[PDB]
Amino acid sequence: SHMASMKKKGSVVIVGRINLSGDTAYAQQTRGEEGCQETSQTGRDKNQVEGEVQIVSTATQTFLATSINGVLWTVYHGAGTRTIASPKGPVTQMYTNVDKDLVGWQAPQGSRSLTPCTCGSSDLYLVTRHADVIPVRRRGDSTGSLLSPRPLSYLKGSSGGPLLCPAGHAVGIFRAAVSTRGVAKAVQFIPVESLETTMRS
Ligand SMILES: CC(C)(C)[C@@H]1NC(=O)O[C@@H]2CCC[C@H]2OC/C=C/C(F)(F)c2nc3ccccc3nc2O[C@@H]2C[C@@H](C(=O)N[C@]3(C(=O)NS(=O)(=O)C4(C)CC4)C[C@H]3C(F)F)N(C2)C1=O
Ligand SMILES: [Cl-]
Ligand SMILES: [Zn+2]
Numbered sequence: 001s002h003m004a005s006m007k008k009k010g011s012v013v014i015v016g017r018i019n020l021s022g023d024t025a026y027a028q029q030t031r032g033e034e035g036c037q038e039t040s041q042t043g044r045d046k047n048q049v050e051g052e053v054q055i056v057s058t059a060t061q062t063f064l065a066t067s068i069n070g071v072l073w074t075v076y077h078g079a080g081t082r083t084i085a086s087p088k089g090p091v092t093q094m095y096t097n098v099d100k101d102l103v104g105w106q107a108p109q110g111s112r113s114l115t116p117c118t119c120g121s122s123d124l125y126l127v128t129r130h131a132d133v134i135p136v137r138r139r140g141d142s143t144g145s146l147l148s149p150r151p152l153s154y155l156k157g158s159s160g161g162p163l164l165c166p167a168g169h170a171v172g173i174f175r176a177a178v179s180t181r182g183v184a185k186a187v188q189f190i191p192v193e194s195l196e197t198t199m200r201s
Contacts, residue, residue, distance in 0.1 A: 010040030011085040012074075014047065014108070015062070016055035018131050018161075025131040027055065043083055043090030049108040053161060055129055058082065064129055064160035067113040068170045068195060071095065071104040074160035075175055079103050095198055101175050102190055102198065114162060116192045117169030124171055126187060128158040136163060136187060138171070143178065145186045152179050155187070163189055 013036045016029040030047055031039065036057055039045045054065045056074065065074035072084070076098050083090035084105045095104035107113055122138035126146075132154070136144035144163065155177050163172040172189035179185070 009080070009082055010037075010059055011043040011045075011083045011090045012056050012058055012065075012079050013039045013045060013085045014049060014054045014065075015057045017049075017051040018053040018055070018064070018127055018129070019051060020053065020127070021051065025127065025133055027129065027131045029055070039085045043085045044087065045085035046087050049110040050112070052112050052114050053127060054108075054111070056084075056160070062129075062157055064158055064174075066160060066162045066170065066173055067107040067111045068116060068162075068173075068192060069199060070107045070113055071195070071199065072107045072111065073102065073104045073173050073190075073195060075173070076101045076103050078159055084108075097198060100190055100194060100198070102173070102195070104195075104198075114164070114168070114170035116196060117165045117167070117171045119165045119167060119169065121165045123166055124163045125166075126158075126163050126174060127161050128155065129161065130154075130158075139186065141191055142172070142175075143186055143188050146184060149183050149185045152177055152182050152184050155184050163187075 063078040124136040126134040135147040138144045161174045176188040177184040
């Protein structure tokens with residue numbers, strides 16, 4: 001009840017990226033923990049942003065965010081309603097949908113966006129925060145099976161990451177794992193058509 005001392009939550013901060021520009025996928029860190037903490041409080045991130053898949057952090061969580069159609073998308077269970085840090089200060093979400101576990105901000109200047117897939121293909125690839133590229137067979141509008149199951153630990157921290165088609169288009173945003181006895185056999189994702197609906201109107 002003491003408003004004068006109520007705290008403010010920090011901004012989401014870009015702390016690195018998944019480099020997909022060459023023949024090898026690899027994670028790059030662009031900001032260490034101290035700078036991340038400062039940037040979360042000010043909301044002012046002067047780092048140059050590059051690429052399609054960002055590694056992002058709050059004070060308590062780290063996950064991914066993916067640019068599609070000029071929007072940097074991630075999961076609500078990671079970002080909540082938080083702003084993202086940018087060169088001129090905190091940027092408010094332009095999309096928030098808790099029912100889809102989805103949020104989005106305008107894509108950062110310097111980022112590149114994935115194109116929404118129109119291939120109608122079921123052979124997908126999940127990109128993790130460790131730059132592992134995991135083949136996934138699409139099994140429905142929002143699920144796909146891992147060709148090689150993996151412990152949940154392998155996938156933790158990769159919500160917000162993309163599923164891509166063979167042509168490198170965005171098919172979806174990783175949301176939740178389908179896990180039994182700690183082994184993830186499948187993944188559940190926000191399909192790009194749901195993003196496009198959220199964007200259209
Ligand atoms: C058992 C399990 C594997 C932990 C869990 N499975 C699970 O629930 O499966 C069911 C059955 C099939 C689909 C799914 O239907 C329920 C829908 C869940 C949801 F996702 F839509 C979701 N909506 C929310 C909306 C608002 C607030 C909180 C919400 N919380 C949610 O789910 C929560 C979160 C999500 C999660 O952990 N995501 C990942 C991740 O990396 N996060 S993260 O980066 O480390 C981090 C926590 C920093 C942000 C990708 C999976 C990684 F670990 F593989 N969850 C639990 C799970 O995946
Ligand atoms: Cl959805
Ligand atoms: Zn495609």
